[PDB]
Amino acid sequence: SRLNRESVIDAALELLNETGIDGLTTRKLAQKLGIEQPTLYWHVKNKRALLDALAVEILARHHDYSLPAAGESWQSFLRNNAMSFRRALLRYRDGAKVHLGTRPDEKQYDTVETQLRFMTENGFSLRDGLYAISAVSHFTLGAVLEQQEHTNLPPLLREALQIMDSDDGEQAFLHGLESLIRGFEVQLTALLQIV
Amino acid sequence: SRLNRESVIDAALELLNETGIDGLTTRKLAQKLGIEQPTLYWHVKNKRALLDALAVEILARHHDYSLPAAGESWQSFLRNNAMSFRRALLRYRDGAKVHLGTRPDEKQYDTVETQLRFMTENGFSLRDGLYAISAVSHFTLGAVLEQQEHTNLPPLLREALQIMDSDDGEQAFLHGLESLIRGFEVQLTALLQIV
Ligand SMILES: CN(C)[C@@H]1C(O)=C(C(N)=O)C(=O)[C@@]2(O)C(=O)C[C@@H]([C@]3(C)OC(=O)c4c(O)ccc(Cl)c43)C[C@@H]12
Ligand SMILES: CN(C)[C@@H]1C(O)=C(C(N)=O)C(=O)[C@@]2(O)C(=O)C[C@@H]([C@]3(C)OC(=O)c4c(O)ccc(Cl)c43)C[C@@H]12
Ligand SMILES: [Cl-]
Numbered sequence: 001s002r003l004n005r006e007s008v009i010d011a012a013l014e015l016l017n018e019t020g021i022d023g024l025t026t027r028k029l030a031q032k033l034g035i036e037q038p039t040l041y042w043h044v045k046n047k048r049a050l051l052d053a054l055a056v057e058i059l060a061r062h063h064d065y066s067l068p069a070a071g072e073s074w075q076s077f078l079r080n081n082a083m084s085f086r087r088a089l090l091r092y093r094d095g096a097k098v099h100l101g102t103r104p105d106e107k108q109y110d111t112v113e114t115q116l117r118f119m120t121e122n123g124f125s126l127r128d129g130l131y132a133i134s135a136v137s138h139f140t141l142g143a144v145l146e147q148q149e150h151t152n153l154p155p156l157l158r159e160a161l162q163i164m165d166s167d168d169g170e171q172a173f174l175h176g177l178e179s180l181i182r183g184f185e186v187q188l189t190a191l192l193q194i195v
Numbered sequence: 196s197r198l199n200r201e202s203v204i205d206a207a208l209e210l211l212n213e214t215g216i217d218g219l220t221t222r223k224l225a226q227k228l229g230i231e232q233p234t235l236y237w238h239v240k241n242k243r244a245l246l247d248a249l250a251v252e253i254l255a256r257h258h259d260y261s262l263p264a265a266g267e268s269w270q271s272f273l274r275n276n277a278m279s280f281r282r283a284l285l286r287y288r289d290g291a292k293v294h295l296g297t298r299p300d301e302k303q304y305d306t307v308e309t310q311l312r313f314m315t316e317n318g319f320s321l322r323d324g325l326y327a328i329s330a331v332s333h334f335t336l337g338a339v340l341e342q343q344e345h346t347n348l349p350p351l352l353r354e355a356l357q358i359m360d361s362d363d364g365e366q367a368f369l370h371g372l373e374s375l376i377r378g379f380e381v382q383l384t385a386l387l388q389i390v
């Protein structure tokens with residue numbers, strides 16, 4: 001079938017859902033494409049090249065709140081952005097694991113640039129602006145990884161693990177998202193006072 | 196050489212540092228032990244069994260602030276516990292990736308039980324107590340994963356990525372750790388008031 005970038009990524013993302021990250025190979029991507037391995041090699045040099053492209057394409061396709069609404073509070077932007085990132089990570093099997101170990105692609109540099117600028121415009125230094133955004137990203141990544149991977153107890157543990165499996169991680173994630181944002185705001189608001 | 200659990204884990208953890216999680220195999224653990232694969236199979240049934248045991252052993256060996264000091268504020272406990280967890284995850288190559296996809300082993304049930312109880316004793320419901328501890332765990336896991344895996348820019352991005360690589364993730368992690376704990380405290384302190 002067709003072997004333009006878009007077609008190669010469609011098959012590879014569909015295969016990822018079948019196989020996971022561990023069992024995804026170039027040879028079986030060739031299978032799905034109705035093609036021989038050396039044909040595919042022309043288009044994609046190996047598994048590392050492929051995952052890199054899938055990581056970039058998972059953001060472009062499905063992370064659609066990368067940018068603040070005109071007038072949006074910084075708080076609300078980190079909220080919506082966190083939720084979008086999570087959902088984009090959740091849309092494919094092992095998607096957090098696909099995302100792990102890549103930086104933003106050229107194509108989105110200006111988007112991470114705008115995110116960082118937007119924060120500095122709301123009273124953050126570039127550093128504290130970065131730390132808050134990184135924090136959102138690491139909390140969000142960790143919660144999706146744990147969620148996606150979880151796919152004689154003592155009393156409080158038995159009851160805690162019933163509360164963890166009673167959804168897809170959403171409740172726990174959104175509660176701790178609010179703790180993080182308020183924590184940032186408490187930092188922001190104090191300026192140079194001891195807090 | 197000796198094939199008691201402790202010896203098998205010592206070699207496997209040392210091999211993990213050589214190889215990573217991807218390239219760690221039973222066959223090469225047999226190599227390191229001066230033994231044949233079928234001998235090792237008696238002791239360890241496969242790679243999944245091994246990683247499960249390495250995940251448990253990474254905590255037992257190196258995560259030594261699993262418990263509050265008598266009199267410790269809940270804040271300070273989450274701090275020290277977060278730092279310890281991080282450091283235990285950082286001590287081996289792909290240690291976050293080894294930890295991902297296991298729950299606490301029997302051996303530490305009472306420790307996670309005590310953690311949860313301790314929080315309920317300081318004004319948390321079991322749920323909000325769980326959400327704060329899970330949040331610490333997901334933030335901490337995500338920051339180590341990103342750190343351990345990172346092993347024409349626009350101006351703010353160029354400068355942000357210089358600040359991210361200027362240490363091992365410690366600065367960014369500890370700053371966002373404090374945002375999280377204060378965020379929790381703002382939640383705790385409000386009781387039933389709108390906040
Ligand atoms: C979830 N969001 C907060 C961010 C985001 O909106 C995007 C995105 N492309 O829209 C990201 O790339 C993010 O999801 C994201 O993962 C990147 C991350 C950050 C700060 O930017 C970086 O360039 C960068 C990096 O190179 C290494 C680590 C980290 Cl945490 C980063 C910013 C993330
Ligand atoms: C880093 N610490 C906050 C915790 C901790 O001290 C320990 C530990 N053995 O000492 C953990 O197991 C932790 O590091 C840890 O990873 C577990 C985690 C928790 C709430 O307990 C669970 O039993 C559990 C679970 O089954 C699934 C997900 C999560 Cl987040 C959890 C608690 C973590
Ligand atoms: Cl074609």
Ligand SMILES: [Cl-]
Pocket residue numbers: 004005006007
């Ligand atoms: Cl195309």
Ligand SMILES: [Cl-]
Pocket residue numbers: 071072073076
């Ligand atoms: Cl708003």
Ligand SMILES: [Cl-]
Pocket residue numbers: 079173174175177178
């Ligand atoms: Cl939220």
Ligand SMILES: [Cl-]
Pocket residue numbers: 196197198199
């Ligand atoms: Cl022996």
Ligand SMILES: [Cl-]
Pocket residue numbers: 199200201202
């Ligand atoms: Cl032993």
Ligand SMILES: [Cl-]
Pocket residue numbers: 266267268271
């Ligand atoms: Cl204290």
Ligand SMILES: [Cl-]
Pocket residue numbers: 274368369370372373
């Ligand atoms: Cl801290």
